[PDB]
Amino acid sequence: HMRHRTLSSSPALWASIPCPRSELRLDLVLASGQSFRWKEQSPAHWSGVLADQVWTLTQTEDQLYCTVYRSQVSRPTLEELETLHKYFQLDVSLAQLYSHWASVDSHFQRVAQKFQGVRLLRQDPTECLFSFICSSNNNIARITGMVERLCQAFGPRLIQLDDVTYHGFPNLHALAGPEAETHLRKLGLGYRARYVRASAKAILEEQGGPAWLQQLRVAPYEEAHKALCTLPGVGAKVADCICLMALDKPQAVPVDVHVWQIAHRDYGWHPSPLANKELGNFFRNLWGPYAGWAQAVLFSADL
Ligand SMILES: CC1(C)CC(NC(=O)c2csc3cncn23)C1
Numbered sequence: 286h287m288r289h290r291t292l293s294s295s296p297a298l299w300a301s302i303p304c305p306r307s308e309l310r311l312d313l314v315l316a317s318g319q320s321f322r323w324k325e326q327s328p329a330h331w332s333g334v335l336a337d338q339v340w341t342l343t344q345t346e347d348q349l350y351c352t353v354y355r356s357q358v359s360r361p362t363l364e365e366l367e368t369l370h371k372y373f374q375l376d377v378s379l380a381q382l383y384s385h386w387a388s389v390d391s392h393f394q395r396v397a398q399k400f401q402g403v404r405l406l407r408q409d410p411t412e413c414l415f416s417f418i419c420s421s422n423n424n425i426a427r428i429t430g431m432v433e434r435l436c437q438a439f440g441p442r443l444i445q446l447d448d449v450t451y452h453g454f455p456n457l458h459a460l461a462g463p464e465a466e467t468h469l470r471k472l473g474l475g476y477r478a479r480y481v482r483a484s485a486k487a488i489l490e491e492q493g494g495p496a497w498l499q500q501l502r503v504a505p506y507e508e509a510h511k512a513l514c515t516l517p518g519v520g521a522k523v524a525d526c527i528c529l530m531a532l533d534k535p536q537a538v539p540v541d542v543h544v545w546q547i548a549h550r551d552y553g554w555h556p557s558p559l560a561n562k563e564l565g566n567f568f569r570n571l572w573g574p575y576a577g578w579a580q581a582v583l584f585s586a587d588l
């Protein structure tokens with residue numbers, strides 16, 4: 286009986302954040318393989334869960350409109366609005382980064398002209414870690430399915446809008462239980478079910494809980510990366526995604542075969558674990574300390 290809001294349907298329940306579409310394009314960020322929890326439930330309107338709350342987001346050329354579902358219905362609070370400002374990292378100027386990258390990279394300049402407003406979300410470490418464990422040998426639509434079924438089966442029910450039931454991301458204890466792997470295989474995760482259960486268990490038992498991920502957020506990149514790579518199902522590529530996307534390491538550059546292809550084809554680059562590391566160093570040396578943000582532009586431009 287509760288329905289997803291549109292800007293038309295519910296004018297009184299939207300706040301706005303001044304946001305040029307050069308600083309953020311929702312449609313190039315929210316289903317571009319960073320977060321797997323946003324869906325365009327009606328045209329130009331993106332709905333998904335942030336913490337214990339559902340949001341719907343839409344934008345004009347100059348304004349980002351948001352509405353939150355929790356309580357009697359009301360507009361987002363200043364605090365809730367600050368959460369969203371932090372999630373999109375809107376303190377950082379994307380126009381200024383784009384021009385700094387273009388100054389040393391003509392390929393980026395060409396490719397970025399049509400793909401403005403591609404920025405990096407600042408994601409919850411737990412959600413990001415388990416989402417990217419599920420991302421091995423996978424595509425966006427299937428990862429999206431696995432994450433949603435995982436949240437339904439293990440996370441707290443938040444609300445229903447139209448036919449969509451929203452759940453919070455599970456805690457580690459929920460993912461670490463004795464039937465968790467078997468249940469996750471029923472939900473279609475395959476071998477990734479093992480890594481989910483075992484990484485939840487590892488963080489709880491060997492690292493002291495989720496405070497450990499917050500510690501990695503403040504630790505230096507190389508230390509964070511090394512620490513993540515001790516987890517089941519987390520190798521260099523996945524660790525770099527998490528570094529970039531959840532641990533505030535903007536220089537982290539995830540290297541897979543697709544980045545090799547681009548580097549070789551579009552940059553003329555020529556040199557395994559060692560060469561993958563060398564390629565990440567190449568892009569840091571070229572673009573600087575926000576190299577992973579630059580790569581996100583190219584990734585989201587290639588989609
Ligand atoms: C396995 C996937 C479909 C999900 C993964 N996402 C990315 O690799 C990515 C999104 S933005 C960025 C910057 N560097 C890597 N990425 C591909």
Ligand code: NI
Pocket residue numbers: 549555
């Ligand atoms: Ni060649």
